[PDB]
Symmetry: C3
């Protein structure tokens, strides 16, 4: 650990500063809690209401937000870039990451003869690499994880401990899979028999995880019966998420924790799926669609914008619906007020 | 380019299935009925496709006898089966993508098996799996890499346990059972003794989890053991991924619980029940035979009669359809009062 | 093994408890109060179950002194206790069904322990568990098979970790803590900066996860680490299966989170709070001490006073209960508007 002054911090960040440049800083903290020795940031408007009174010895602020608060006696770090990224730079100054302590390929790691392991890879204890698997260069295979038969882990990916990647899975470049996640599990499909009974079907389709994808903890992705399941590049998936068989997740999308997409559904590019939300099967989510948390998308969405509720309706339309449902006592009163002036006899 | 090429007749004889049309027709893959080309094999599956069979350019269509008789006059290559068209199709599919194992045959040396545990003939135990005291693994079983077969736990013949499954102590697994990676079977139930004003004290659960024949359990699904009673999944039932089965829950025969749904404690589910994805079911209630819950259903009382159910709380489909409608048509109902209120005379 | 039968009297002595009914009454197991036959011991702890008491053919009923006084006139075999009837029932439960361990005592040959890690006394580490650099295993801990104790992470005394648990790096586990199988403690939190292109950049999370004393965590539950600050779960709190705890979430003392519930980033849950199954609580909000949230609740804003809440969005029990009732009433309501328009002549 070390200390940086406000002027000394500015040059390292390549950021213009305003205020008392001798302010000494020894850590990092959020805007609502930071002490004089702490550094902070502001990127949003529904956050700026806490800036007026903040002890922080350094505040990272954009050129836009700086305009509304520049006169205030606070110490500033004014940047034309995202205040959040500039803030991470400051975070990575103070805390250092730590690995397991088992570098390279651990003697325990069982690797199948026919598997191809590239140069500069780390395989932690008790990991199992199956037949004809291809672990790329500069990859990390976490402790106890499983790389399935004929599966490919593209270069620079990071598999965390105890992860099951099943047979025939394409993992892209620099993909990060959190611990406990399962890729290429069987899709929930059965033969609906005549006595009402359910007969298993071996799903054999590929699961393709493209470059720059992130998969959260214990998230499960199902493979199709014989066609592909795809999570297109730059998409970020959170914890405990369900991706059904033959789902296509479009590029640079986000699926928040505990959300679920049902079988054979196309999610478009730059789509946000809120937490605990549920999108049903055989439907299409248009590009740039934002779901609220706990949304039931039952029909296909065919235009961008903010959606929410069960079923899915535009934000404007549910925000009005909720505030009109809340209005039902008052509306009934107006009926009682009207059923009072029906004492009309003559 | 595909794996293999068959004639219509050659393939028909391989399947032990009658054919109609050009027996010489070359067939080199499979496809969905509405996409299949000449080289492709497909199946008509009783549901739709009346007009979509007529205009199908497939080189082979797997059809039931009852349905071939109806489409007898059509100019198509038919593979007529007495079994399920889809089930036959599976065999066909498996000729073009042959299913693959991890490439570790037999019982791997790195498998820890308790001296007391009994392992039957022709079983396969993959690397790093653990078989605890007095466990009983039936013949033709598969224990996936680094899975745990708990103390006094039994696994019926021909059952397939995938990698990193935990089967706790005192859990009974039927024959032909398939468990996807990372399921937890026999975890403690969420029940406690309250004491010292709201403080919760651990209760040891000593009930069993009884999984019956031909049952499937999805990936990272968790099934809790009872306090003293048992948690039972009856014959042929299919539980998807990320499902939660609480302590002392009973699921009847040939029932389906889709991904991310949860049943609370001491609740009985009937036979031929479909529990929609993400749906929730309260504890100490009953779900009758042949009940179907839509996704995200919140069941708060018992359901005694069959049919389709939706909403939170759950009500018979038609009712919640009628509700969403009326709720949506609230502004129209308000203008119906507002303009009616405008009539204010004498 | 245990076709074990005890007399009502024998049991009463072991229980150190007052009784009513024939001493010789032979009891050979436990059963729930609705179903209990003459062979069986059962308990009445919950007042919703006082119904099944009147017609009970049970061989023995564990009961509080107050409930006995109330149902005194009944001719049933009573075991009368001043403690929790459920706890006393637990003592019987264990007499018939003895618990069991894996059968691999102490530190198993096949465990991997990084030389720099510290292992205390009377600790059990099961087959193929991995303990990473500079970890600390408290005295009399249980590490389940194939469990990972990540770097610089510490596990307190008498803590019980079940098989295939991932404790990621820099995670503090308190004393007595029990973690069910498949749990992930200390995964990276969900945080990205979206570029003026639509592309999402990975923000590295360096914060800890602090699990306090007597905390329990359910199967396949995931608790994320903060970006800089910590995610804390305080004393006594019990978390169920399949639960999401986002980065920088603080959970209070003696709080309960039922299965499949979720808490978004940087939210503080107070003490003695119940979060119903599958409930969802947004980020950057606070939940007051002594708050119950019904299952499937969608909490979109801070709850600042104690009570029972429900629905999506969340409103206090009273109001939501009315709201649902009035939505139920809609068809009847507009029929009154129809008869209103009927008279216009
Ligand atoms: C979440 C859960 O799992 N159970 C809740 C349920 O408890 P509940 O009283 O239903 O008991 P639990 O469901 O917790 O325990 C399971 C077994 O206890 C048996 N039993 C319970 C009480 C009794 O006096 N006699 C008896 O035999 C039930 O028949 C059942 O078979 O509602 C109570 C509040 O109303 C809560 O305290 C519990 O957290
Ligand atoms: C509730 C929720 O879903 N939050 C997420 C959301 O909110 P948001 O964009 O606000 O990010 P967060 O604020 O949650 O980031 C984590 C920390 O940043 C602090 N903070 C935030 C804004 C600000 O102007 N100054 C400040 O100091 C917060 O107090 C918090 O402790 O998108 C972020 C990506 O950018 C994620 O990292 C957040 O976790
Ligand atoms: C007759 C079944 C009920 C119909 C509604 C169920 C489909 C909606 C699913 C909600 C989203 C959850 C995604 C999980 C589905 C899956 O993995 O199979
Ligand atoms: C507090 C009661 C609210 C009403 C409940 C209706 C919605 C059902 C949701 C049940 C959650 C299912 C998860 C299993 C719970 C458990 O493990 O005990
Ligand atoms: C009709 C629905 C309205 C209710 C929506 C509010 C519910 C909020 C749910 C958010 C909790 C999800 C937890 C995910 C954790 C994470 O973000 O990483």
């Amino acid at each position: 650990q070390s200390t940086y002054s406000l002027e000394q911090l500015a040059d390292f960040l390549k950021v213009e500063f305003q205020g008392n440049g001798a302010t000494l800083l020894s850590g990092v903290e959020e805007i609502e809690e930071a002490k004089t020795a702490h550094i902070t940031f502001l990127d949003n408007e529904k956050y700026a209401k806490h800036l007026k009174s903040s002890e922080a010895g350094a505040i990272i602020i954009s050129r836009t937000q700086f305009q509304k608060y520049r006169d205030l006696n606070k110490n500033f770090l004014i940047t034309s870039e995202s205040p959040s990224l500039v803030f991470q730079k400051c975070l990575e100054l103070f805390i250092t990451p730590v690995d397991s302590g088992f570098p390279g390929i651990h003697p325990t790691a069982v690797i199948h003869p026919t598997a191809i392991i590239e140069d500069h890879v780390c395989i932690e204890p008790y990991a199992v690499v199956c037949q004809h698997a291809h672990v790329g260069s500069a990859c990390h295979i976490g402790s106890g994880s499983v790389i399935g038969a004929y599966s490919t882990v593209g270069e620079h990916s990071y598999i965390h401990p105890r992860v099951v990647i099943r047979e025939r899975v394409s993992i892209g470049k620099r993909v990060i899979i959190q611990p406990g996640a399962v890729i290429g599990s069987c899709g929930f499909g059965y033969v609906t028999s005549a006595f009402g009974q359910h007969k298993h079907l071996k799903h054999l389709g590929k699961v393709i995880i493209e470059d720059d994808v992130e998969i959260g903890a214990n998230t499960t992705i199902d493979r199709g019966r014989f066609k592909h399941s795809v999570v297109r590049e730059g998409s970020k998936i959170d914890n405990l998420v369900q991706i059904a068989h033959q789902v296509e997740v479009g590029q640079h999308s986000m699926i928040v924790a505990q959300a679920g997409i049902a079988g054979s559904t196309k999610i478009g590019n730059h789509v946000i799926i809120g937490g605990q939300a549920g999108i049903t099967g055989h439907i299409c989510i248009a590009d740039h669609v934002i779901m609220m948390a706990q949304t039931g998308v039952t029909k296909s969405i065919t235009s961008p914008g903010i959606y929410g509720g069960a079923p899915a309706r535009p934000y404007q339309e549910i925000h009005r619906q909720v505030a009109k449902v809340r209005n039902l006592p008052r509306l009934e009163e107006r009926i009682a007020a009207l059923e009072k002036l029906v004492q009309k006899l003559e």
